[PDB]
C-alpha cells in the first residue's frame, strides 16, 4: 500500500488542479503567442502520466506481472499513487503558468516567461541530479530514453520498445517544439511557419516511427526472424511514405507543377495503407486477439485476464476509430493540408491518441504477460 | 489506519478549500447584509472541527485514552482524518456560499439565500435521519447536545461538561445568530440593533456559562463536594456579573442616569475577577499543572505525557493572554462598548478563543487521563 501522506498529497494536488482548471475555463469564457500550441505538450504529458498511473493500477489489479515484463526491481516499485501525485503536481504548475500568461499578473516579467519556466522546471525535475524525488525511477527512465533514442546502437528490450511506442503516441510534443522554434526564429508574411512547410517538419513528425523502425531492424538482425520484425518495419515506414507524400502534395499545391494531384492520390492511398497496417498490428499482434484457439471468447484471445469482454470489444472499436483519427492528425500537423482547421483538429485529436495509447498499453501488457508475443523473454 | 480513500478525500477537500480561500481573498481585495456576522459562525465551526481532528490525533499519539474519558465505544472511533474531511467539506461549502454572495452569479436568486441554505445544509447534515456520513457519531453528538442544554435534568459526565465548555468557547455563534434575527426583524433607524443594546443580548451571551454553572450545581447536589463544584460555579457566574454590568453601563450611556461611571468601575472589577478566576481554574485544576509533587518539571505536574515541556509553557502563556482576550471579546459583543471597532475586534478574537479552547482540550484531556481531575471515574 502507498503511504498515507502520499495519498493525501495526491488528493490535495487533484483538488488544486481541478479548481485551477475551473478558474482557467471561467477566465477563458469571460476574459502575441500561440498559447494553445505552447501548452498542448504539457497538457498531453500530464494526461499521459495520469493514464500511466491508471495503467499501473489496472496491471496490478489484473495480476499482470508488469514488473517482470519491464524488468523492474521487484523489491522497489513505483505505485500508481506516485504517478498520480507527479501528474497532479505538474498539472498545478501547468495551470498556474497558463493563468499567469492569461492574466500577466506581474508586468515586468513577460508572458512567455511562465511557459519557459514551466517547461524548464519539468525538464530539471526529470533530470534532477539530487535524489529528492523518485530518483531511482527518474534515472531508470533517463537510461531507457537514452537507449531508445539510440535505437540501433543498443539491443532492444520490452521497455525500449514500449517507450518508443509511447514517444510515437507523443509526436505532437515534438511537432509543437519544432513549431515554437520556427515561431521564435521567424515570427519574433507573418504566419510564415504555419503557411509553409519543409522537410525538417516531416522529419520531426516521423522521428518516433524512425526510432521504432530502427529498433525493429536491430531486433531482426539479432534474432534473424524476418517475418515479424520486417512486417513491423513496413508498418512504421508506411508513416514515412504517407508524410512525404503529403509534404509533396502541399508543396506542389503552393506551386503547381502538374504533379499535385499525383501526390494527393499517393498520400490518401498510403494513409489508408498505414491506418490498416497499424490497426491490424495492434489488434492481432500487440493484443493477440482474433486468435483461432479462442473458442469461448469471440474475436478475443482464449485467455483474458480482464473481467469483461465488453472492455475488449470497446477497445477494438476505440482502436480503429482513434487509429484513423491519429493518422488524420499526423497528416494535419505534418503539412498545411487543411489550413484553418488543422490546429484545432490536432489539438482535439492528440488527447484521443493519448487515450488510445493508454488502452493499447493495457492490452499489450496483458498479452505480453499471457504470451511472449514480444519475444523479449527466454 | 484510516482508509486510503478517506485520506484522498481529505486531501482533495483541503486543496479545494485552500484554492477557494485564495479566490475569496483575491475577490475581496479586488472588490445590504452583514456578511461578516453571517459567515463568522460557519468559519468558527469549521475551525473548531479542524482543531478537534488535531486534538484527536494528538490524544492518540500521546497515549491519552480519550476514548475511555469520553466513554466512547472502543470498537467504533472517529479518526482525526474523518474530522479533517468533514471540516474541509464544510469549509468548501462555506467558501462557495461566500463567493456566490460576493459575485451574485444568479440574478433571479436573492443574495440572502446563499448563506441560509449553506447553514441549512449543516443543520440537515447534523440531523440527517439516514444512516450515512458517520451517523452513529452524529447521533451521539445530538444526544450529548440535548443533555447539555437540559443540564439540570441529567447528571453531568465528562462528555457533557466538555461539550458545555466547547459551547462556552463558541458563544460568538449564538451572538451572531441573535444579531441576525434582530437585523431581520428591525432593519429589514439604520443599524438599530448594532447601535443599541438590550437585555436579551446579555441573556444570549450567558447561555453557555449558564449551562456550565447549572451543571456544576447539579454535580454539587449529586456528590455533595462543595469546594470544586462551588468554586467552578462562582467562576462561571463571574461572566454573568461582567456581562450584566457591561450591559447596564451601555444602557446608562444611551440614557444618562448619572451612574455610568459606577457601572464602568464595577464592570472593570468583575472583568478582572472573571479573567483571573477562569485563568487560575484552567491552569491549576483543568490542566493539573504547577503541582507541588513535581520536582523535575517546574510549574508543571509530576507526570507529563507530551514530549515537550515547552509545549506546556507555551500553552500556559497563550492561555494567560487569550483568557483576557476572550473576556474582552464577550464584553464588547454583549454590549455597545466599541460600536466603531467592536465587530472587528470580536471577529479577530473569536478564532483566537477557539484555538485557546483547542489547547485547553488537549491539556485537560491529558490531565484527566493521568488523574481524575474531573472525578468522572471511580
Ligand atoms: C516528447 C517529449 C517527452 C516525452 C515524454 C517522455 C517520457 C515520459 C514517458 C514515460 C515514462 C515511463 C513510464 C514508466 C513505464 C514503466 C512502468 C512503471 O511504472 O515503472 C516505474 C518506472 O518509473 C519511471 O520510469 C518514472 C515514471 C514517470 C515519472 C515522470 C518524471 C517527470 C517527467 C517530466 C517531463 C519530462 C520531459 C520534459 C518536458 C518536455 C517503476 O518505478 P521504480 O522506481 O520501480 O523504477 C525502477 C527503478 N529501479 C529499477 C532502479 C528500482
Ligand atoms: C451553534 C451550535 C454549533 C454546533 C455545536 C458544536 C459542535 C458540534 C460538533 C462537534 C462536537 C462534538 C465533539 C466530540 C469530540 C469527542 C472526541 C472524538 O473525536 O470522539 C468521537 C466523537 O464523535 C462525535 O461526537 C463526532 C465528532 C463531530 C463530527 C461532525 C458532526 C457534524 C457536526 C455539524 C454541526 C452543524 C451545526 C449547524 C449550526 C447549528 C468518537 O467518534 P465515534 O464515531 O466513536 O462517535 C461515538 C459514536 N458511538 C458512541 C456510537 C461509538
Ligand atoms: C468510450 C469508448 C470508445 C472508450 C473505449 C472503452 C474504455 C472506456 C475501456 C477500454 C479499455 C477499458 C479498461 C480495460 C481494463 C481495465 C482494468 C480493470 O481492472 C479496471 C477497468 C479498466 C481500466 C477498463 C476501463 C474501461 C476502458 C478504459
Ligand atoms: C501563542 C504562542 C506564544 C504559543 C502558541 C503555542 C501553540 C502553537 C502550542 C500550544 C500547545 C501545543 C500542542 C501541544 C501538544 C501537541 C501534541 C503533539 O503530539 C503534536 C504537537 C501538539 C499539537 C502541539 C502543537 C503546538 C501547540 C498547539
Q: Which ligand is nearest to the CA of B313?
A: 4
Task: Kindly report the backbone phi and psi dihedral angles of residue B374, in degrees, each rounded to the nearest multiple of 5, phi listed first.
Answer: -80, -10
CB–CB of B167/B208 below 8 Å? Answer: yes
Q: What was the resolution (in A) of this experimentally determined structure?
A: 3.0
The verdict on B14 touching A (C-beta cutoff 8 Å) is: yes
Residue ranges of the domains in chain A? 1-63+79-133, 155-378
Q: Specify the residue with its C-alpha closest to ligand 2, atom 11.
A: B141
CB atoms within 10 A of CB B167: 19
CA B78 from centroid of its chain's CA atoms: 20
Q: Is A3 on the interface with B (CB under 8 A)?
A: no
* Cβ contact A14–B10 (<8 Å): no
| Dihedral in degrees, nearest 10, Cα atoms B200, B204, B206, B208 | 160
CB-based contact A227:A198 (threshold 8 Å)? no
Chain centroid to Cα A31, Å, comes to 32
Q: Are B179 and B193 in contact (CB under 8 A)?
A: yes
Ligand 4 pocket at CB < 6 A: B 54, 58, 61-62, 306, 311, 314-315, 317-318, 359, 362
Radius of gyration of chain A, Cα coordinates, nearest whole angstrom:
22
DSSP line for B161-180: HHHHHHHHTTHHHHHHHHHH
Question: How far apart (Å, rounded) are the C-alpha atoms in residues A45 and A38?
Answer: 12
Pocket test residue of A59, A307, A315 for ligand 3, highest count of atoms within 8 A of CB: A315
Upper half-sphere CA count for residue B27 (Cβ side, 13 Å): 16
Q: How many Å from the N-terminal Cα to the C-terminal Cα in chain A?
A: 31
Nearest-angstrom CA–CA distance, B18 and A16: 8
Reference A55, options A78, A75, A88, A21; nearest CA is: A78
Radius of gyration of chain B (CA): 22
Q: Do B20 and A18 touch (CB under 8 A)?
A: no
The reply to whether ligand 1 has any atom less than 6 angstroms from the CB of A78 is yes
H or E element, residue B48: helix B35-62
Minimum-distance CB partner of B15 among A1, A13, A23: A13
Tell if the CB–CB gap between A12 and B15 is shorter than 8 Å. yes
Distance from Cα A81 to the centre of ligand 1, integer Å: 14
Q: Is A356 annotated as a binding residue?
A: yes
Report which ligand 4 atom has the smallest distance to the Cα of B315.
Answer: 10
Cell 508513416 belongs to residue? A239
Q: Does A15 touch chain B (CB under 8 A)?
A: yes
C-alpha cell at B141: 453528538
Measured distance CA(A305)–CA(A363) in Å, rounded:
10
Determine the atom of ligand 1 nearest the C-alpha atom of A45: 5
**Among the listed residues A306, A319, A324, the one whose alpha carbon sits nearest the alpha carbon of residue A365:** A306
Interface of B with A in 160-199 (CB under 8 A): none
Q: Does the Cβ of B140 fall within 6 Å of ligand 2?
A: yes
A229 within 8 A of A219, measured Cβ to Cβ: yes
Is B52 near ligand 2, meaning CB less than 6 Å away?
Answer: yes
The owner of cell 530518483 is A135
Beta carbons of B283 and B312 less than 8 angstroms apart: no
Give the closest ligand to the alpha carbon of residue A78.
1
Q: Is the CB of B173 under 6 A from ligand 2?
A: yes
- Asked if A117 is an interface residue toward chain B (Cβ–Cβ < 8 A), one would say no
**B9 in reach of chain A (CB within 8 A):** yes
**Residue A279 to residue A316: CA distance in whole angstroms:** 9
**Alpha helices, DSSP H, located in chain A:** 4-30, 35-62, 66-69, 80-103, 113-126, 135-149, 158-169, 171-182, 192-195, 199-223, 226-254, 260-280, 309-334, 341-370
Q: What is the DSSP letter of A306?
A: S
Q: Annotation-wise, does B222 bind a ligand? A: no
CA B27 to chain centre: 29
Tell me how close the Cα of B54 comes to any Cα of chain A, in angstroms.
16
Let me know: does B20 contact B95? Beta carbons within 8 Å: yes
CB contact under 8 A, B20 and A19: yes
Chain B residues whose beta carbon lies within 8 Å of the beta carbon of residue A12: 11-12, 14-15
B24 chain-A contacts, CB cut-off 8 A: none
Q: For residue B235, give the C-alpha cell.
A: 467562576
DSSP for residue B284:
I
Q: Give the span between the Cα atoms of A143 and A152, in whole angstroms.
A: 15
Instruction: Decide whether any atom of ligand 2 lies within 6 Å of the B310 Cβ.
Output: no
Long-range CB pairs of A177-184, under 8 A, 24+ apart, other chains included: A177/A41, A177/A204, A178/A204, A179/A34, A179/A37, A180/A34, A180/A37, A180/A38, A183/A34
**b/e map of B258-281 (b: 16 or more CB within 10 Å)?**
eebeebbebbeebbebbbebbbeb
Size of interface A-B (CB pairs under 8 A): 57
Q: Do B9 and A11 touch (CB under 8 A)?
A: yes
Q: Which residues in chain B are closer than 8 Å to A10, comparing Cβ atoms?
A: 8, 11
* Residue A185 DSSP one-character state: I
Amino acid at each position: 500500500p502507498a503511504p498515507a501522506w502520499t495519498t493525501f498529497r495526491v488528493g490535495l494536488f487533484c483538488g488544486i488542479f481541478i479548481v485551477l482548471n475551473i478558474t482557467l475555463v471561467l477566465a477563458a469564457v469571460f476574459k502575441i503567442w500561440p498559447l494553445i500550441r505552447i501548452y498542448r505538450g504539457g497538457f498531453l504529458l500530464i494526461e499521459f502520466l495520469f493514464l500511466l498511473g491508471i495503467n499501473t493500477y489496472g496491471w496490478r489489479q489484473a495480476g499482470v506481472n508488469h514488473v517482470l515484463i519491464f524488468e523492474l526491481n521487484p523489491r522497489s516499485n513505483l505505485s500508481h499513487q506516485h504517478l498520480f501525485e507527479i501528474a497532479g503536481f505538474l498539472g498545478i504548475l501547468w495551470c498556474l503558468s497558463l493563468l499567469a500568461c492569461f492574466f500577466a499578473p506581474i508586468s515586468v516579467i513577460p508572458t512567455y516567461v511562465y511557459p519557459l519556466a514551466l517547461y524548464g522546471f519539468m525538464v530539471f525535475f526529470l533530470i534532477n541530479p539530487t535524489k529528492t524525488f523518485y530518483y531511482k525511477s527518474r534515472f531508470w527512465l533517463l537510461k531507457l530514453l537514452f537507449r531508445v533514442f539510440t535505437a540501433p546502437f543498443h539491443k532492444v528490450g520490452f521497455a525500449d520498445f514500449w517507450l518508443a511506442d509511447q514517444l510515437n503516441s507523443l509526436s505532437v510534443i515534438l511537432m509543437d517544439l519544432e513549431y515554437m522554434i520556427c515561431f521564435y526564429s521567424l515570427e519574433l508574411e507573418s504566419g510564415i511557419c504555419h503557411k509553409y512547410t519543409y522537410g525538417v517538419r516531416a522529419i520531426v513528425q516521423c522521428i518516433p516511427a524512425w526510432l521504432r523502425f530502427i529498433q525493429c531492424l536491430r531486433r531482426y538482425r539479432d534474432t534473424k526472424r524476418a517475418f515479424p520484425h520486417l512486417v513491423n518495419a513496413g508498418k512504421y515506414s508506411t508513416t514515412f511514405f504517407m508524410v512525404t507524400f503529403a509534404a509533396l502534395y502541399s508543396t506542389h499545391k503552393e506551386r503547381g507543377h502538374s504533379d499535385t494531384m499525383v501526390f494527393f492520390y499517393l498520400w490518401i492511398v498510403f494513409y489508408i495503407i498505414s491506418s490498416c497496417y497499424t490497426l491490424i498490428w495492434d489488434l492481432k499482434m500487440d493484443w493477440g486477439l482474433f486468435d483461432k484457439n479462442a473458442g469461448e471468447n469471440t474475436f478475443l484471445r482464449e485467455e483474458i485476464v480482464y473481467p469483461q469482454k465488453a472492455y475488449y470489444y470497446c477497445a477494438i472499436i476505440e482502436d480503429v476509430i482513434l487509429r484513423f483519427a491519429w493518422t488524420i492528425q499526423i497528416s494535419i500537423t505534418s503539412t498545411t493540408l487543411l489550413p484553418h482547421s488543422g490546429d484545432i483538429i490536432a489539438t482535439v485529436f492528440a488527447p484521443l491518441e493519448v487515450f488510445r495509447r493508454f488502452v493499447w498499453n493495457f492490452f499489450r501488457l496483458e498479452n505480453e504477460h499471457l504470451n511472449n508475443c514480444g519475444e523479449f523473454r527466454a
